[PDB]
Amino acid sequence: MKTYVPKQVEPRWVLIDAEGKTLGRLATKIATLLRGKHRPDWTPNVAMGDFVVVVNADKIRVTGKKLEQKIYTRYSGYPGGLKKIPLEKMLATHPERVLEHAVKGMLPKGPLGRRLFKRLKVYAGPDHPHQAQRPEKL
Amino acid sequence: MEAKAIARYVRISPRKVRLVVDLIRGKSLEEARNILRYTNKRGAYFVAKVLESAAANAVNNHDMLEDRLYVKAAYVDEGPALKRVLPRARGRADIIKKRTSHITVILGEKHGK
């Protein structure tokens, strides 16, 4: 025969917690969902993996000293442009990042790996734009 | 019908006249006429004249009435190249090329019914 090709599938939204979950353990799952890898109809080259909006990120938990320890680096092309912000302050200002980040490096990278990150919309809250389905999960 | 007039075996390098042509490429006789009157490249003279002779065929030969006359294909294809020598010192006779081109305006008529 010849293995099957899902036609234009509908984009199923979801929603996951945040608060209480361990930062990394979360994405691990979350990731998989952004791609079709949970779906019994996954396909590499199409991105039909679930739009994961997330609620109250600001209360993400994580282990050890990572609160203080963990360092979020950023380097402009300008010599000496290396700016390293800690997980700590990173919670305090725009905490949503920390998730989106832990995440954004659990995808692959070719032009769609980033298309998929657009398929993700966390907030520190809860709240979101109640657009549709978004059936809660666990 | 259509009206053929080529400019075979003519001085000046392509690039220049290739540039001249594409400006007027596919337009009215009246239009392009007024364009050529006010464009600043010796091509202006050349293209204008060969275009006028392209219209001249459509007058006394094929006939499509001057009113209806619109411009199709004008291509300008390179010919050979004039080979001369250049006064560069230190013992080297450089080579220089005065190119030659082929402006080919074909202006047909308005309607097709």
Binding site: Y4, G36, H38, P40, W42, P44 | -
Partner: protein, 117 residues
């Protein structure tokens, strides 16, 4: 005996050129660049055949795993059962029953966890 070659070479080069005709860059009209590019292309073809094998093996196994968890649990178990049952195939290829007709699948799932779950 003028052993003048003739055009022979031009014809051969025409062949390999036609072989490469399409590629980006002068390597599509350069009957030597076309040759090198072509070389790459062919070795590529071979490697990409055996790689095609394990590629599609994999993709099959992917949807198989995800759907396996969708019903009961993990692919590893699933198969382990199917093997310690007697299902001397399932045909990883056509293990993709999960794709079309999930009933069949879930039945084989029952048979899987039955086998030695």
């Amino acid at each position: 005996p003028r052993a003048k070659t003739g055009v022979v070479r031009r014809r051969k080069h025409k062949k390999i050129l036609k072989l490469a005709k399409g590629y980006w860059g002068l390597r599509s009209k350069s009957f030597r660049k076309a040759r090198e590019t072509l070389f790459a292309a062919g070795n590529y073809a071979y490697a990409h055949r055996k790689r095609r094998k394990r590629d599609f093996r994999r993709l099959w196994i992917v949807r198989i795993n995800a759907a396996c968890r969708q019903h009961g649990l993990n692919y590893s178990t699933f198969i382990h059962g199917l093997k310690k049952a007697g299902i001397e195939v399932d045909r990883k290829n056509l293990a993709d029953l999960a794709v079309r007709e999930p009933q069949v699948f879930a039945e084989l799932v029952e048979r899987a966890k039955a086998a030695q779950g």
